[PDB]
Amino acid sequence: FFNSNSFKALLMSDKTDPANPVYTWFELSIPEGDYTVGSLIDMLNNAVVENYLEVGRQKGVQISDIGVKFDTRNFSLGRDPLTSLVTPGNYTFKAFHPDIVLLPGCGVDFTHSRINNMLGMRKRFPYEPGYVITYEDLVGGNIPALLDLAKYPGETSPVLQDPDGNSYHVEEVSPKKWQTKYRSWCLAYNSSQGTLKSEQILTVPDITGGLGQLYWSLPDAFKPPVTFTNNTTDISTQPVTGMHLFPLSQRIVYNTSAVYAQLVEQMTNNTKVFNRFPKNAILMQPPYDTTQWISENVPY
Amino acid sequence: HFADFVDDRRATAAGNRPNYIGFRDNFIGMMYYNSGSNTGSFSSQTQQLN
Numbered sequence: 001f002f003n004s005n006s007f008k009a010l011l012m013s014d015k016t017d018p019a020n021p022v023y024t025w026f027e028l029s030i031p032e033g034d035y036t037v038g039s040l041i042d043m044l045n046n047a048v049v050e051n052y053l054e055v056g057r058q059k060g061v062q063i064s065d066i067g068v069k070f071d072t073r074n075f076s077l078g079r080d081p082l083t084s085l086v087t088p089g090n091y092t093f094k095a096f097h098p099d100i101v102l103l104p105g106c107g108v109d110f111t112h113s114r115i116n117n118m119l120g121m122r123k124r125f126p127y128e129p130g131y132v133i134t135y136e137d138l139v140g141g142n143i144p145a146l147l148d149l150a151k152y153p154g155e156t157s158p159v160l161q162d163p164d165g166n167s168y169h170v171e172e173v174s175p176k177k178w179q180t181k182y183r184s185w186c187l188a189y190n191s192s193q194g195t196l197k198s199e200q201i202l203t204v205p206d207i208t209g210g211l212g213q214l215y216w217s218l219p220d221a222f223k224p225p226v227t228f229t230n231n232t233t234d235i236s237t238q239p240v241t242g243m244h245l246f247p248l249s250q251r252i253v254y255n256t257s258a259v260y261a262q263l264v265e266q267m268t269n270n271t272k273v274f275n276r277f278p279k280n281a282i283l284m285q286p287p288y289d290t291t292q293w294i295s296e297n298v299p300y
Numbered sequence: 301h302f303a304d305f306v307d308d309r310r311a312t313a314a315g316n317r318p319n320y321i322g323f324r325d326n327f328i329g330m331m332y333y334n335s336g337s338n339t340g341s342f343s344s345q346t347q348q349l350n
Contacts, residue, residue: 229348230343230349230350231341231343231348231350233340
């Protein structure tokens with residue numbers, strides 16, 4: 001009812017010996033319920049790869065071509081600016097803010113949906129109609145490559161052959177300096193170039209999503225307000241006798257009993273869903289943020 | 301329709317019952333009278349009272 005489940009993602013679904021596949025805009029969905037940003041970004045990645053299983057893999061596309069992934073952790077935390085790789089060989093397993101990693105020709109739409117408010121991204125102009133976070137819009141701020149444990153005295157090794165044949169699509173802009181093809185919304189926000197700062201904003205993840213005001217309307221006893229009219233007799237427009245904020249507040253919880261508790265859960269209740277890429281180092285199980293906002297319903 | 305059916309050969313037939321379907325006398329039921337749910341209004345403008 002409140003339009004917070006269904007959206008578009010523009011996933012690549014064709015293999016034509018690559019050169020030019022058709023991208024084919026389509027609409028996604030997710031089942032309704034009482035969700036939290038830790039548990040939802042587990043299953044909103046499931047909503048992406050749900051249409052991978054009956055159009056993507058039934059066409060012939062490569063396994064490591066999942067277009068839109070909703071990530072939580074910051075890349076380039078162990079990355080020193082002198083050596084263009086990340087130093088410990090693994091991206092830091094700790095979530096800061098939920099963002100979006102993408103591929104070429106692969107956006108995400110937020111026109112008729114309200115998941116952007118409950119993921120933690122908005123515009124800086126709330127009055128323009130609709131926006132698509134396309135590729136080449138978050139320009140600057142590629143995810144870097146990595147270094148392996150072996151042969152590090154002697155070579156630098158941006159190699160991509162380790163995750164069971166999944167290719168990282170690493171890039172070489174500068175000689176001996178290495179980036180990849182993926183582009184995150186966090187690294188494109190604090191980028192040295194910019195151009196995403198001018199139209200996007202960081203905010204609280206906001207599990208409510210900023211619900212609209214709830215109007216009271218009662219024609220049969222109250223005289224109308226200053227500019228309203230009696231005769232419309234519609235369920236849409238009525239003489240409003242008062243507004244207030246929709247009674248759906250947030251309860252906070254925070255712990256040092258964080259993301260390690262998620263590792264204890266997936267050892268139990270034996271489960272391979274939500275975790276179709278356990279060893280990709282990009283499409284892994286994303287870390288929970290250290291605080292979860294629980295949405296309750298106080299009587300107003 | 302069939303009035304008695306045994307085999308595809310031997311079966312009697314009878315026409316369907318005549319079912320005249322039209323509007324009511326005086327077009328009753330076209331309009332919501334006697335309603336607080338669907339109440340039509342003849343209200344003046346500027347003094348909007350019903």
